[PDB]
Paper text:
Protein kinase CK2 (former name: casein kinase 2), a serine/threonine kinase of the CMGC subgroup of eukaryotic protein kinases (EPKs), is involved in cellular key processes like cell cycle progression, evasion of apoptosis and DNA damage repair. Structurally CK2 predominantly occurs as a heterotetrameric complex with a central dimer of non-catalytic subunits (CK2β) to which two catalytic subunits (CK2α) are attached. For the catalytic subunit in humans and other vertebrates, two paralogous isoforms exist. They are typically denoted as CK2α and CK2α′ and have highly similar sequences with exception of their completely unrelated C-terminal segments.
To clarify the structural bases of 4p’s inhibitory effect on CK2 we determined complex structures of the compound with functional variants of the two isoforms of the human catalytic CK2 subunit, namely with CK2α1−335 and with CK2α′Cys336Ser. In fact, the CK2α1−335/4p complex could be crystallized under conditions with strongly differing salt concentrations while the CK2α′Cys336Ser/4p complex crystallized only under low-salt conditions. (ii) As mentioned in the last section structural plasticity or even “hypervariability” of the hinge/helix αD region—casually accompanied by the occurrence of the αD pocket —is a significant feature of human CK2α, but it was never observed so far in structures of maize or yeast CK2α and human CK2α′ where the hinge/helix αD region was always found in the open conformation without any exception. The CK2α′Cys336Ser/4p complex of this study confirms these experiences: neither do the two CK2α′Cys336Ser protomers deviate from the open hinge/helix αD conformation nor did we observe any crystallization hit under high-salt conditions. The lack of any conformational ambiguity in the hinge/helix αD region of the CK2α′Cys336Ser/4p complex is also perceptible from the final atomic B-factors which reflect the mobilities of the atoms in the crystalline state: they are low in the whole hinge/helix αD area of the CK2α′Cys336Ser/4p complex while in both CK2α1−335/4p complex structures high mobility sections exist, namely either at the helix αD (low-salt structure) or at the hinge (high-salt structure). (iii) Finally, the CK2α′Cys336Ser/4p complex structure provides a further case of a cis-proline (Pro73) residue in the β3/αC loop. The Lys/Pro dipeptide in the β3/αC loop is absolutely conserved in the sequences of CK2α homologs, but it is completely unknown so far under which conditions a cis-peptide bond can be trapped within this dipeptide and whether a functional relevance is associated with this feature. The binding of 4p mainly depends on hydrophobic interactions between the aromatic four-ring system and suitable side chains of the enzyme. Compared to the extensive hydrophobic embedding polar interactions contribute only marginally to the affinity of 4p to CK2, but they are critical for its orientation within the ATP site.
Residue numbers in the entry: 5 to 333
The structure:
Protein backbone atom coordinates (compact mmCIF):
# COMPACT_ATOMS: atom_id res chain seq x y z
CA UNK A 1 0.00 0.00 0.00
CA UNK A 2 1.20 3.53 -0.82
CA UNK A 3 2.49 5.84 1.92
CA UNK A 4 0.74 8.92 3.26
CA UNK A 5 1.61 12.02 5.31
CA UNK A 6 -0.46 14.69 7.03
CA UNK A 7 -1.17 17.72 4.80
CA UNK A 8 -0.33 20.05 7.72
CA UNK A 9 1.56 19.87 11.02
CA UNK A 10 3.29 16.72 9.75
CA UNK A 11 6.66 17.25 11.44
CA UNK A 12 5.59 19.21 14.54
CA UNK A 13 6.40 16.54 17.11
CA UNK A 14 9.88 15.97 15.73
CA UNK A 15 10.49 19.72 16.06
CA UNK A 16 9.77 19.57 19.81
CA UNK A 17 11.83 18.10 22.64
CA UNK A 18 11.61 14.31 22.82
CA UNK A 19 10.12 14.72 26.31
CA UNK A 20 6.98 16.25 24.65
CA UNK A 21 5.82 13.14 22.74
CA UNK A 22 7.75 10.37 24.62
CA UNK A 23 4.82 9.75 26.91
CA UNK A 24 6.11 6.36 28.04
CA UNK A 25 8.71 8.40 29.93
CA UNK A 26 6.14 10.70 31.54
CA UNK A 27 5.74 10.07 35.26
CA UNK A 28 2.54 11.52 36.72
CA UNK A 29 2.43 12.79 40.30
CA UNK A 30 -0.56 11.19 42.06
CA UNK A 31 -2.35 13.20 44.72
CA UNK A 32 -4.88 12.02 47.28
CA UNK A 33 -8.41 11.50 45.91
CA UNK A 34 -9.84 12.09 49.40
CA UNK A 35 -9.58 15.84 48.68
CA UNK A 36 -12.59 15.16 46.39
CA UNK A 37 -16.08 14.05 47.49
CA UNK A 38 -18.01 12.30 44.73
CA UNK A 39 -21.43 13.94 44.41
CA UNK A 40 -23.24 12.69 41.30
CA UNK A 41 -22.54 10.08 38.66
CA UNK A 42 -22.31 11.77 35.29
CA UNK A 43 -21.67 8.88 32.93
CA UNK A 44 -18.82 6.77 31.69
CA UNK A 45 -16.27 6.00 29.02
CA UNK A 46 -14.60 2.82 27.77
CA UNK A 47 -12.32 2.51 30.77
CA UNK A 48 -13.74 5.02 33.23
CA UNK A 49 -16.57 6.13 35.52
CA UNK A 50 -17.16 9.88 35.61
CA UNK A 51 -18.52 11.71 38.64
CA UNK A 52 -19.30 15.25 39.58
CA UNK A 53 -17.36 16.12 42.71
CA UNK A 54 -16.56 18.95 45.10
CA UNK A 55 -12.98 19.72 46.08
CA UNK A 56 -13.41 19.82 49.85
CA UNK A 57 -10.41 22.13 50.26
CA UNK A 58 -11.89 25.01 48.24
CA UNK A 59 -15.60 24.17 47.57
CA UNK A 60 -14.94 24.15 43.82
CA UNK A 61 -17.05 21.94 41.56
CA UNK A 62 -14.96 19.53 39.45
CA UNK A 63 -15.26 16.28 37.48
CA UNK A 64 -13.46 13.09 38.59
CA UNK A 65 -12.77 10.42 35.94
CA UNK A 66 -11.83 7.09 37.58
CA UNK A 67 -9.65 4.88 35.34
CA UNK A 68 -10.57 1.19 35.58
CA UNK A 69 -9.23 -1.16 34.32
CA UNK A 70 -5.77 0.31 34.24
CA UNK A 71 -3.16 0.12 31.48
CA UNK A 72 -0.21 2.18 32.69
CA UNK A 73 1.11 3.10 29.24
CA UNK A 74 -2.32 4.32 28.15
CA UNK A 75 -2.73 6.40 31.31
CA UNK A 76 0.65 8.05 30.71
CA UNK A 77 -0.49 8.84 27.19
CA UNK A 78 -3.78 10.43 28.18
CA UNK A 79 -2.16 12.41 30.99
CA UNK A 80 0.73 13.66 28.83
CA UNK A 81 -1.58 14.62 25.97
CA UNK A 82 -3.83 16.51 28.39
CA UNK A 83 -0.88 18.42 29.82
CA UNK A 84 0.44 19.24 26.32
CA UNK A 85 -3.02 20.55 25.39
CA UNK A 86 -3.73 22.50 28.61
CA UNK A 87 -4.93 26.03 28.00
CA UNK A 88 -5.81 25.06 24.46
CA UNK A 89 -8.97 26.53 22.99
CA UNK A 90 -12.04 24.48 24.01
CA UNK A 91 -9.86 21.56 25.26
CA UNK A 92 -11.09 20.14 28.56
CA UNK A 93 -8.81 21.33 31.35
CA UNK A 94 -7.01 18.67 33.40
CA UNK A 95 -6.78 20.00 36.97
CA UNK A 96 -5.33 17.14 39.00
CA UNK A 97 -4.24 13.50 38.95
CA UNK A 98 -5.09 11.54 42.10
CA UNK A 99 -5.43 8.04 43.51
CA UNK A 100 -7.80 6.60 46.06
CA UNK A 101 -5.50 6.11 49.10
CA UNK A 102 -6.77 2.53 49.74
CA UNK A 103 -7.35 1.01 46.28
CA UNK A 104 -4.58 3.10 44.64
CA UNK A 105 -6.93 3.36 41.66
CA UNK A 106 -6.09 6.37 39.46
CA UNK A 107 -8.41 9.24 38.62
CA UNK A 108 -8.14 12.36 36.43
CA UNK A 109 -9.70 15.60 37.72
CA UNK A 110 -11.17 18.07 35.19
CA UNK A 111 -12.90 21.39 35.12
CA UNK A 112 -16.67 20.96 35.41
CA UNK A 113 -18.83 21.68 32.32
CA UNK A 114 -22.62 21.69 32.68
CA UNK A 115 -23.41 19.58 29.61
CA UNK A 116 -26.74 19.36 27.83
CA UNK A 117 -27.10 15.80 26.54
CA UNK A 118 -26.73 15.97 22.77
CA UNK A 119 -29.92 13.99 22.21
CA UNK A 120 -31.86 16.74 23.97
CA UNK A 121 -29.60 19.51 22.61
CA UNK A 122 -29.73 18.49 18.96
CA UNK A 123 -33.54 18.78 19.06
CA UNK A 124 -33.24 22.54 19.67
CA UNK A 125 -30.11 23.62 17.74
CA UNK A 126 -30.64 26.36 15.15
CA UNK A 127 -28.67 26.92 11.97
CA UNK A 128 -26.63 29.60 13.70
CA UNK A 129 -26.00 27.32 16.70
CA UNK A 130 -24.67 24.60 14.46
CA UNK A 131 -22.25 27.01 12.77
CA UNK A 132 -21.15 28.41 16.15
CA UNK A 133 -20.53 25.09 17.93
CA UNK A 134 -18.92 23.49 14.87
CA UNK A 135 -16.57 26.49 14.70
CA UNK A 136 -15.67 26.13 18.37
CA UNK A 137 -15.08 22.38 17.88
CA UNK A 138 -12.82 23.17 14.89
CA UNK A 139 -10.74 25.51 17.04
CA UNK A 140 -10.10 22.64 19.45
CA UNK A 141 -9.18 20.32 16.58
CA UNK A 142 -6.91 22.83 14.86
CA UNK A 143 -5.29 23.38 18.23
CA UNK A 144 -4.69 19.73 19.11
CA UNK A 145 -3.53 18.94 15.56
CA UNK A 146 -1.09 21.88 15.70
CA UNK A 147 0.17 20.20 18.93
CA UNK A 148 0.89 16.92 17.08
CA UNK A 149 -2.16 15.12 18.46
CA UNK A 150 -5.03 13.18 16.82
CA UNK A 151 -8.09 12.81 19.00
CA UNK A 152 -9.39 9.69 17.18
CA UNK A 153 -12.71 9.56 19.12
CA UNK A 154 -14.60 12.65 17.87
CA UNK A 155 -18.37 12.08 18.41
CA UNK A 156 -21.25 13.97 20.06
CA UNK A 157 -20.73 12.13 23.35
CA UNK A 158 -17.21 13.58 23.50
CA UNK A 159 -18.21 17.22 22.88
CA UNK A 160 -19.47 18.85 26.10
CA UNK A 161 -21.70 21.87 25.48
CA UNK A 162 -23.06 24.17 28.15
CA UNK A 163 -25.86 25.61 26.02
CA UNK A 164 -26.76 28.20 28.66
CA UNK A 165 -23.27 29.73 28.72
CA UNK A 166 -22.69 28.73 25.07
CA UNK A 167 -19.44 26.95 26.04
CA UNK A 168 -17.83 23.90 24.38
CA UNK A 169 -15.16 21.43 25.49
CA UNK A 170 -13.77 18.43 23.61
CA UNK A 171 -13.30 15.63 26.15
CA UNK A 172 -12.05 12.02 26.59
CA UNK A 173 -8.54 12.03 25.26
CA UNK A 174 -8.00 8.39 26.14
CA UNK A 175 -7.75 7.30 22.50
CA UNK A 176 -5.72 10.28 21.33
CA UNK A 177 -2.25 9.68 19.94
CA UNK A 178 0.81 11.61 18.73
CA UNK A 179 1.15 11.94 14.95
CA UNK A 180 4.53 10.92 13.53
CA UNK A 181 5.17 10.75 9.77
CA UNK A 182 4.90 7.25 8.27
CA UNK A 183 3.88 5.70 11.57
CA UNK A 184 1.34 2.89 11.30
CA UNK A 185 -1.50 3.23 13.80
CA UNK A 186 -4.10 0.90 15.29
CA UNK A 187 -7.29 1.25 13.27
CA UNK A 188 -9.55 0.05 16.11
CA UNK A 189 -10.32 3.59 17.26
CA UNK A 190 -13.45 5.82 17.15
CA UNK A 191 -17.08 4.83 17.39
CA UNK A 192 -18.27 2.78 14.40
CA UNK A 193 -20.45 5.58 13.10
CA UNK A 194 -17.57 8.10 13.04
CA UNK A 195 -14.79 5.84 11.68
CA UNK A 196 -13.28 7.19 8.52
CA UNK A 197 -12.98 4.93 5.49
CA UNK A 198 -9.27 4.52 6.15
CA UNK A 199 -10.06 2.68 9.39
CA UNK A 200 -12.78 0.57 7.75
CA UNK A 201 -10.40 -0.68 5.00
CA UNK A 202 -7.52 -1.21 7.48
CA UNK A 203 -5.24 1.60 6.16
CA UNK A 204 -2.93 2.24 9.10
CA UNK A 205 -0.89 5.27 7.95
CA UNK A 206 -3.59 7.79 8.81
CA UNK A 207 -3.30 11.22 10.41
CA UNK A 208 -5.20 14.24 11.80
CA UNK A 209 -7.60 14.03 8.85
CA UNK A 210 -9.34 11.11 10.59
CA UNK A 211 -10.86 13.63 13.03
CA UNK A 212 -12.08 15.69 10.08
CA UNK A 213 -14.14 12.75 8.80
CA UNK A 214 -15.67 12.31 12.24
CA UNK A 215 -16.45 16.01 12.34
CA UNK A 216 -18.12 15.84 8.91
CA UNK A 217 -20.28 12.98 10.22
CA UNK A 218 -21.39 15.18 13.12
CA UNK A 219 -22.09 18.12 10.81
CA UNK A 220 -24.22 15.87 8.57
CA UNK A 221 -26.26 14.58 11.48
CA UNK A 222 -26.84 18.05 12.91
CA UNK A 223 -27.96 19.79 9.74
CA UNK A 224 -29.94 16.81 8.36
CA UNK A 225 -31.23 15.55 11.75
CA UNK A 226 -30.34 11.95 10.94
CA UNK A 227 -28.24 10.87 13.94
CA UNK A 228 -25.89 9.13 13.61
CA UNK A 229 -25.65 10.00 9.92
CA UNK A 230 -24.03 6.76 8.68
CA UNK A 231 -25.67 4.12 10.82
CA UNK A 232 -23.78 0.88 10.18
CA UNK A 233 -24.71 -2.30 12.08
CA UNK A 234 -21.07 -3.58 11.85
CA UNK A 235 -17.80 -2.39 10.31
CA UNK A 236 -18.57 -3.90 6.90
CA UNK A 237 -22.05 -2.37 6.85
CA UNK A 238 -20.55 0.98 7.91
CA UNK A 239 -18.52 1.22 4.69
CA UNK A 240 -21.54 0.14 2.64
CA UNK A 241 -23.65 2.93 4.17
CA UNK A 242 -20.93 5.46 3.29
CA UNK A 243 -20.64 4.08 -0.23
CA UNK A 244 -24.41 4.39 -0.75
CA UNK A 245 -23.88 8.15 -0.33
CA UNK A 246 -20.42 9.01 -1.71
CA UNK A 247 -20.64 6.33 -4.42
CA UNK A 248 -18.75 3.15 -5.18
CA UNK A 249 -16.62 4.39 -8.08
CA UNK A 250 -15.13 7.10 -5.91
CA UNK A 251 -14.47 4.38 -3.31
CA UNK A 252 -12.62 2.23 -5.84
CA UNK A 253 -10.58 5.25 -6.91
CA UNK A 254 -9.47 5.82 -3.30
CA UNK A 255 -8.45 2.17 -2.95
CA UNK A 256 -6.51 2.36 -6.20
CA UNK A 257 -4.71 5.51 -5.11
CA UNK A 258 -3.44 3.85 -1.92
CA UNK A 259 -3.07 0.27 -3.28
CA UNK A 260 -5.54 -1.10 -0.71
CA UNK A 261 -6.63 -4.68 -1.15
CA UNK A 262 -10.29 -4.83 -0.14
CA UNK A 263 -11.53 -7.53 2.24
CA UNK A 264 -13.23 -9.92 -0.22
CA UNK A 265 -16.38 -10.10 1.88
CA UNK A 266 -17.11 -6.59 0.57
CA UNK A 267 -17.52 -8.05 -2.93
CA UNK A 268 -20.77 -9.63 -1.70
CA UNK A 269 -22.23 -6.52 -0.06
CA UNK A 270 -20.90 -3.29 -1.62
CA UNK A 271 -22.80 -3.38 -4.91
CA UNK A 272 -22.53 -0.33 -7.17
CA UNK A 273 -23.87 3.09 -6.21
CA UNK A 274 -23.73 6.52 -7.81
CA UNK A 275 -22.84 9.53 -5.69
CA UNK A 276 -25.94 11.10 -4.14
CA UNK A 277 -26.44 14.86 -4.14
CA UNK A 278 -26.26 16.20 -0.59
CA UNK A 279 -29.52 17.99 -1.45
CA UNK A 280 -31.22 14.56 -1.59
CA UNK A 281 -31.16 14.58 2.26
CA UNK A 282 -33.16 17.78 2.60
CA UNK A 283 -36.85 17.70 3.55
CA UNK A 284 -39.35 19.80 5.48
CA UNK A 285 -37.99 18.78 8.92
CA UNK A 286 -34.36 19.91 8.27
CA UNK A 287 -34.71 22.57 5.55
CA UNK A 288 -34.18 25.40 8.04
CA UNK A 289 -30.76 23.95 8.97
CA UNK A 290 -29.33 23.44 5.47
CA UNK A 291 -27.77 26.07 3.19
CA UNK A 292 -25.54 25.91 0.10
CA UNK A 293 -22.58 26.79 2.34
CA UNK A 294 -23.29 23.93 4.73
CA UNK A 295 -23.41 21.48 1.85
CA UNK A 296 -20.24 22.77 0.23
CA UNK A 297 -18.37 22.42 3.54
CA UNK A 298 -19.82 18.96 4.18
CA UNK A 299 -18.74 17.87 0.72
CA UNK A 300 -15.13 18.88 1.43
CA UNK A 301 -15.06 17.00 4.78
CA UNK A 302 -16.74 13.73 3.81
CA UNK A 303 -14.21 12.54 1.26
CA UNK A 304 -12.83 8.99 1.01
CA UNK A 305 -9.30 10.32 0.41
CA UNK A 306 -8.20 11.48 3.83
CA UNK A 307 -5.53 13.62 2.20
CA UNK A 308 -8.09 15.66 0.35
CA UNK A 309 -10.37 16.45 3.31
CA UNK A 310 -10.17 20.05 4.55
CA UNK A 311 -7.79 20.75 7.39
CA UNK A 312 -9.38 22.13 10.52
CA UNK A 313 -7.92 25.55 9.67
CA UNK A 314 -9.28 25.53 6.12
CA UNK A 315 -12.66 24.48 7.47
CA UNK A 316 -12.60 27.46 9.84
CA UNK A 317 -12.15 29.76 6.81
CA UNK A 318 -15.13 28.31 4.94
CA UNK A 319 -18.06 30.67 4.18
CA UNK A 320 -20.38 28.48 6.30
CA UNK A 321 -18.78 30.14 9.35
CA UNK A 322 -18.95 33.77 8.14
CA UNK A 323 -22.00 34.46 10.38
CA UNK A 324 -19.99 33.31 13.38
CA UNK A 325 -16.68 35.02 12.66
CA UNK A 326 -18.60 38.23 11.84
CA UNK A 327 -20.40 38.23 15.23
CA UNK A 328 -17.07 37.20 16.91
CA UNK A 329 -14.79 39.96 15.55
C1 LIG B 1 -22.87 17.49 33.68
C2 LIG B 1 -22.88 16.33 32.73
C3 LIG B 1 -24.21 15.69 32.51
C4 LIG B 1 -21.78 15.92 32.14
C5 LIG B 1 -20.45 16.58 32.28
O1 LIG B 1 -19.44 15.69 31.78
C6 LIG B 1 -18.14 16.14 31.82
C7 LIG B 1 -17.83 17.44 32.19
C8 LIG B 1 -16.52 17.88 32.21
C9 LIG B 1 -15.47 17.03 31.90
C10 LIG B 1 -15.74 15.74 31.54
C11 LIG B 1 -17.09 15.26 31.49
C12 LIG B 1 -17.04 13.89 31.04
C13 LIG B 1 -15.67 13.50 30.82
C14 LIG B 1 -15.68 12.16 30.34
C15 LIG B 1 -17.02 11.76 30.25
N1 LIG B 1 -17.84 12.82 30.68
C16 LIG B 1 -19.33 12.83 30.72
C17 LIG B 1 -19.89 12.81 29.31
C18 LIG B 1 -19.88 11.73 31.61
C19 LIG B 1 -17.47 10.41 29.78
C20 LIG B 1 -16.38 9.76 28.93
C21 LIG B 1 -15.01 9.84 29.56
C22 LIG B 1 -14.59 11.25 29.95
O2 LIG B 1 -13.41 11.57 29.95
C23 LIG B 1 -14.80 14.65 31.15
O3 LIG B 1 -13.58 14.76 31.10
NA1 LIG C 1 -15.90 8.78 25.54
Amino acid sequence: AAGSRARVYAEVNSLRSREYWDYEAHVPSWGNQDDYQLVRKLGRGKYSEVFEAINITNNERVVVKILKPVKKKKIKREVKILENLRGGTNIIKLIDTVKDPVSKTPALVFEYINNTDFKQLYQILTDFDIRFYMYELLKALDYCHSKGIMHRDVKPHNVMIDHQQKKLRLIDWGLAEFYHPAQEYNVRVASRYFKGPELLVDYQMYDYSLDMWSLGCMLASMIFRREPFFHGQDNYDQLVRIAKVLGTEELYGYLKKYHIDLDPHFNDILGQHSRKRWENFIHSENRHLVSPEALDLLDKLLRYDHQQRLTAKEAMEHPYFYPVVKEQS
